[PDB]
Amino acid sequence: DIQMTQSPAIMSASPGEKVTMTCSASSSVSYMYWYQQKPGSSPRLLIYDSTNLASGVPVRFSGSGSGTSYSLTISRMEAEDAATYYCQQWSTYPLTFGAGTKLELKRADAAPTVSIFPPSSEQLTSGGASVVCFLNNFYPKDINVKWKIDGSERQNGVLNSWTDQDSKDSTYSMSSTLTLTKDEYERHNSYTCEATHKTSTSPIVKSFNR
């Protein structure tokens, strides 16, 4: 009944770097197991018995550790190594797993393509109004969106959602939805969506007026 802690929870790396994740055990374990789980595919065993590589596993992966500390290292990172890795043990047990470490791929910076949508008439007839803003294909998942109604920043009633890193281009995307009542919506004129991202000192502004 050992608890397993995988730190860092998430990390990014560019091809060619030396990667190292860790797995801590609340109390001593006799040799850990590591699974690799490629997004959208079954997990696969990578390491068995702390250092022994499973068959079909690339030599660039190595495993080490003893006692309550175990680590996974990738001498040279490859694009195809981006995935979640889980450590597992079975010594003093009921068998338990760790919550995984997500190894994301680092890539060149990219600014988001912003689009804004007034509420659909169909929705308006129901008495609600959602303004949607899409910020697509940008790198540093870190971006701050701002909603402004007649100049005032609206911080309540917003829902933000990002997609995982894109398989074809290591990019991210996000949507921010501002839901209001039809009557508070028609009580205002300008609706703005502002994005602040590493790529621009000034923020990206996308707006529309009723």
């Binding site: 079975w90 338990t96 919550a99 949508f117 659909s120 949607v132 899409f134 959602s161 997609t163 839901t179």
Partner: protein
């Protein structure tokens, strides 16, 4: 080859029992190995639930072996999971896996099945179109549905490039999801672009065409 596929309800009321099955093909559950039950999420945390061996029973459950029962149907070639007095803490996605002998590891995993434990009532989604902005990015908004999930395709799955479906966000027992698709200016509006939404739990399916309104 061996596949393994899960099945069970998507929504279960609290304090009720949960039942899930695992069908396997390409291999018989009586030959060797122990085909287990594991659950993950929401915070990625995992929990091994138990196993039933090729010789039947011989099963083990973690110390939380008080509401659980794993059984099998050797004639249909499938094992089952029965969890009782289920609560909100039991919502997760369940996986049935096979544990390879000698080499202590799971070599076959199923597709996973998500189970929500909630007293909330199934609600059908309202699908809104979102006519477009900047080199023409169009969108679809699915809101106010329960439970997860919905399936969204653009033009019966024919259009797959430039699509971005964003994960569902729960806002007070109701869900909201969205999707965008970017096409060339010449494509739309001449070439139709409709959003296809399906919500099995409430048996709702609707095609919503993005008109340049």
């Amino acid at each position: 080859e061996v596949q393994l596929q899960e099945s069970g309800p998507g929504l279960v009321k609290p304090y009720q029992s949960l039942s899930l099955s695992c069908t396997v093909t390409g291999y018989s559950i009586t030959s060797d190995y122990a085909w287990n039950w594991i659950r993950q999420f929401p915070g990625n945390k995992l929990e091994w639930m138990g196993y039933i061996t090729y010789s039947g029973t011989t099963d083990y459950n973690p110390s939380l072996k008080s509401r659980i029962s794993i059984t099998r149907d050797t004639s249909k070639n499938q094992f089952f999971l029965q969890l009782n007095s289920v609560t909100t803490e039991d919502t997760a996605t369940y996986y049935c896996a096979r544990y390879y002998y000698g080499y202590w590891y799971f070599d076959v995993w199923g597709q996973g099945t998500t189970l929500t434990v909630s007293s909330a009532k199934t609600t059908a989604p309202s699908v809104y179109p979102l006519a477009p902005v900047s080199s023409v990015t169009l969108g679809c908004l699915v809101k106010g549905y329960f439970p997860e999930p919905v399936t969204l395709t653009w033009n019966s799955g024919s259009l797959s490039s430039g699509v971005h479906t964003f994960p569902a966000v729960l806002q007070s027992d109701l869900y909201t999801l969205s999707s965008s698709v970017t096409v060339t200016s010449s494509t739309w509006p001449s070439q139709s672009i409709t959003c296809n939404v399906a919500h099995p739990a409430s048996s709702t399916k609707v095609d919503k065409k993005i008109e340049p309104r």
